[PDB]
Amino acid sequence: LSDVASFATKLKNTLIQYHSIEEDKWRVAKKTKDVTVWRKPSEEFNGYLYKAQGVIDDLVYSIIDHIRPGPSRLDWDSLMTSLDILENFEENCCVMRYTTAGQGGISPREFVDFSYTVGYKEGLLSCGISLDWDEKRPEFVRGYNHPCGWFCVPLKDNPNQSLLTGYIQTDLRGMIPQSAVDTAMASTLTNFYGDLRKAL
């Protein structure tokens, strides 16, 4: 990165734009009794942007501390098998690398992502996007995260709880039926909420 501030500002604004997309652009992909996942075509690659929403029985600052790159995230997130900080820019901005266990016959991926955590209304946004990175490790497929992130705000009807909204936009690469991508993305999102709720 040549200009970290400009990059972070563009990423944050992209996520705020996603959070403004109207409901007729979304199609339901998976619905459980306390998480919903929607999908729409991505403007960033040949695949899809996913949105997840669900309530968390905690307040915003501790939730985002659990989600942002750090030891807590690696501990409770069952799909994540490693987490490294590659470069720090500020207290709230870094480049990190994380790896995922395989699922649905898709082999382990690694992602090298810019990460940025910032205030948003009465809550917080933790957003990310993949970056170019030289360390090529044959043990992992380098997947690519297009703009993604987590909004966490007080639940409008009960602010002792929080509303957690996620956007994920991952290119897993390789030959994978979109059905298996769909299942992986929706299962990853619902297990994310499940694991986070149990961590708190």
Mind giving me the DSSP string for 43-74? SSSSSEEEEEEEEESS-HHHHHHHHSSSHHHH
The dihedral sign for the CA sequence 160, 197, 131, 148: negative
91: helix, coil or strand? coil
Closest by alpha carbon to 88, among 192, 173, 4?
Answer: 4
Q: Give the span between the Cα atoms of 188 and 184, in whole angstroms.
A: 6
Q: Which amino acid is at 111?
A: F
What CA–CA distance (Å, rounded) separates 163 from 144?
27
Contact 127, 38 (CB under 8 A): no
2 contacts: CB under 8 Å, gap ≥ 6: none
Is the separation of the CB atoms in 155 and 55 below 8 Å? yes
Resolution for this experimental structure (Å): 1.7
Fold exhibited by the domain 1-200: Alpha-D-Glucose-1,6-Bisphosphate; Chain A, domain 4 (3.30.530)
- For the chain, the structural domain boundaries read 1-200
Q: Quote the CA–CA distance of 145 and 142 in Å, as a whole number.
A: 10
At residue 94's C-alpha, the angle toward residues 123 and 181, to 5°, is 80
Question: What is the spatial distance between Cα 156 and Cα 179, in angstroms, rounded to a whole number?
Answer: 34
**Rounded CA separation 104/193 (Å):** 19
Q: For residues 41 and 49, is the Cβ–Cβ distance under 8 A?
A: yes
Q: What's the token pair of residue 92?
A: 């709230």
Residue 131, token pair as written in the block: 């970056």
